[PDB]
């Protein structure tokens, strides 16, 4: 009797390999592509950024390299913070741009950079940007002769946020809040 045909007993493989988006950095969507977010959404991004920053500090990690181009958006506007990204100066604190001491990194340094990020989120426009001279930035920021222009902020910016920006960029490190305070303020501010 015959060599009969076999309808082959097939197998269906439904395994997955993950894919990830190289999304725009905040810097890119804010200053290059200049896309726009609703005020609520801008707050959601700031909130997630703070929530990540607090977790780093809890683990005793000082981020230091905090730039809006080092923060990335993903689907659902998930914020991913990393080391993955002028800007050599702009986001750093007045003592750090000065190299006033030996790498005086602290949580407040990260706070300063955070405050700068909040400022650009709340303007769509870089701080000090009526001026662009390199030595003038080192002079005027380092010696305390200019704040960022909080007069440039969105009209829809909650007053509490205007204060938060101002607070996070207060000149003295002893004067600015830590993330637990910042985040608490943001959640209260958002509700």
């Amino acid at each position: 009797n015959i060599l009969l045909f076999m309808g082959y007993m097939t197998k269906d493989n439904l395994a997955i390999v993950t894919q990830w988006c190289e999304g725009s950095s905040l810097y890119k969507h804010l200053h290059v592509q200049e896309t726009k977010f609703q005020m609520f959404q801008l707050i959601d991004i700031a909130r997630q950024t703070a929530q990540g920053m607090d977790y780093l500090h809890a683990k005793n990690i000082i981020h230091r390299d905090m730039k809006s181009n080092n923060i990335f958006l993903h689907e659902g506007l998930t914020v991913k913070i990393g080391d993955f990204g002028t800007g050599s100066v702009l986001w750093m604190a007045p003592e750090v741009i000065r190299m006033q001491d030996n790498n005086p990194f602290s949580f407040q340094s990260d706070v300063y950079s955070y405050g700068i990020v909040l400022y650009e989120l709340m303007t769509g426009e870089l701080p000090y940007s009526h001026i662009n001279n390199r030595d003038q930035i080192i002079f005027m920021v380092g010696r305390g002769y200019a704040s960022p222009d909080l007069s440039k902020l969105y009209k829809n910016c909650p007053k509490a946020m205007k204060r938060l920006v101002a607070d996070c960029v207060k000149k003295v490190k002893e004067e600015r809040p830590l993330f637990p305070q910042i985040l608490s303020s943001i959640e209260l501010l958002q509700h």
Binding site: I16, T18, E75, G76
Partner: protein, 61 residues
């Protein structure tokens, strides 16, 4: 049901439907099963060990 669900999931929207029942017998359990309004982004993707049903005994996780 909607407030309980928002607390349990941390969702910002309400649920789509819920089944609530008791099994009587030598096994006694209550259960709530909710269907969310949108599939999560990672419904398939995060491979490791959670289909989101928590088991409690005498109300202790």
């Amino acid at each position: 049901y909607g407030e309980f669900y928002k607390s349990l999931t941390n969702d910002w929207e309400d649920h789509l439907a819920v089944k609530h029942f008791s099994v009587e017998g030598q096994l006694e359990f209550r259960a709530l099963l909710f269907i969310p309004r949108r599939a999560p982004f990672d419904l398939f993707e995060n491979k490791k060990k959670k289909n989101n049903i928590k088991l409690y005994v005498r109300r202790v996780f």
